[PDB]
Design a protein that fits this description.
This is part of a larger assembly, with two copies of chain A. By secondary structure, chain A is mainly beta. Chain A is rod-shaped and about 90 Å long. Chains A and B meet through strand 1 of A and strand 2 of B. Chains A, B: It comes from Shigella phage Sf14.
């Protein structure tokens, strides 16, 4: 199926491959907590008000 | 879109407003214990009779 290890005139089959995908975590972006608030400016302001 | 800090010529964004309403308790009012007794005069009397 495939040429050998150290000779070009002999054969040795290649039985697939194995992959090692890294570990990616979620469960924080998974929860629908952080709802997006797109804007146009480089900085944004907020108003803080309170009473008693 | 409001005036940025430090400069009256560039702009920033005003996303919103956060409010701090004071805590209010209404357990006794919501219990319905005190039945309403509308009154016409400014004072009301009461008779107290008992025996032994």
């Amino acid at each position: 199926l495939t040429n050998s290890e150290k000779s070009r005139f002999f054969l040795a089959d290649l039985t697939g491959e194995v992959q090692s995908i890294p570990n990616t975590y979620g469960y924080i972006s998974g929860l629908g907590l952080f709802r997006s608030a797109p804007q146009t400016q480089t900085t944004f302001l907020m108003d803080l008000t309170d009473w008693d």
